UniProtKB/TrEMBL annotation, chain A:
Assembly: Complex I is composed of 45 different subunits.
Subcellular location: Mitochondrion intermembrane space
Organism: Sus scrofa (Pig)
GO (cellular component) term, any one: mitochondrial intermembrane space
Full protein name: NADH dehydrogenase [ubiquinone] 1 alpha subcomplex subunit 8
Reported function: Accessory subunit of the mitochondrial membrane respiratory chain NADH dehydrogenase (Complex I), that is believed not to be involved in catalysis. Complex I functions in the transfer of electrons from NADH to the respiratory chain. The immediate electron acceptor for the enzyme is believed to be ubiquinone.
Superkingdom assignment: Eukaryota
Signal peptide: none
Name of the encoding gene: NDUFA8
TrEMBL record, chain B:
Superkingdom, taxonomy of origin: Eukaryota
Species in which this protein is naturally found: Sus scrofa
Portion of the parent chain present: 127 to 189 of 189
Subunit details: Complex I is composed of 45 different subunits.
Localization: Mitochondrion inner membrane
Gene behind this protein: NDUFB5
Protein's name in the database: NADH dehydrogenase [ubiquinone] 1 beta subcomplex subunit 5, mitochondrial
Function field: Accessory subunit of the mitochondrial membrane respiratory chain NADH dehydrogenase (Complex I), that is believed not to be involved in catalysis. Complex I functions in the transfer of electrons from NADH to the respiratory chain. The immediate electron acceptor for the enzyme is believed to be ubiquinone.
Coiled coil spans: 4-36
Similarity comment text for this entry: Belongs to the complex I NDUFB5 subunit family.
Length: 57, 63
């Protein structure tokens, strides 16, 4: 019943963060303090839409 | 006593019994329909209450 829609692989292409987990943990506090606005916007969108396909941007 | 007493007593009794018979037939039909469909107060089997659901963020966006 119905056909699922999935974004094309060109829509999932982005410059990945290629640092390991320890590097991320070292600067986790400053990253959370400085980069808070896009992270919070993304997480609110994720919790409200309940759909990974509506939060690519 | 006179015949009118028995006459009218019989008439009242006949009315009462006829009404009771019609009511019994109506009750049987109503019960049959109510059990078949389930849209009346009778035969309302319980379902899960919806007040038990938790509506809160669940540590995972997709619930």
């Amino acid at each position: 019943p119905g056909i699922v829609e999935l974004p094309t692989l060109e829509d999932l292409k982005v410059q990945e963060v290629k640092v390991s987990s320890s590097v991320l943990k070292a600067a986790a506090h400053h990253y959370g303090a400085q980069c808070d606005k896009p992270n919070k916007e993304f997480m609110l969108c994720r919790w409200e839409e309940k759909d990974p396909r509506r939060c690519l941007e | 006593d006179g015949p009118e007493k028995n006459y009218e007593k019989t008439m009242a009794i006949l009315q009462i019994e006829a009404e009771k018979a019609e009511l019994r037939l109506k009750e049987l039909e109503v019960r049959r329909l109510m059990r078949a469909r389930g849209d009346g107060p009778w035969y309302q089997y319980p379902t899960i209450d919806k007040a038990l659901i938790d509506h809160s963020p669940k540590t995972t966006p997709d619930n």
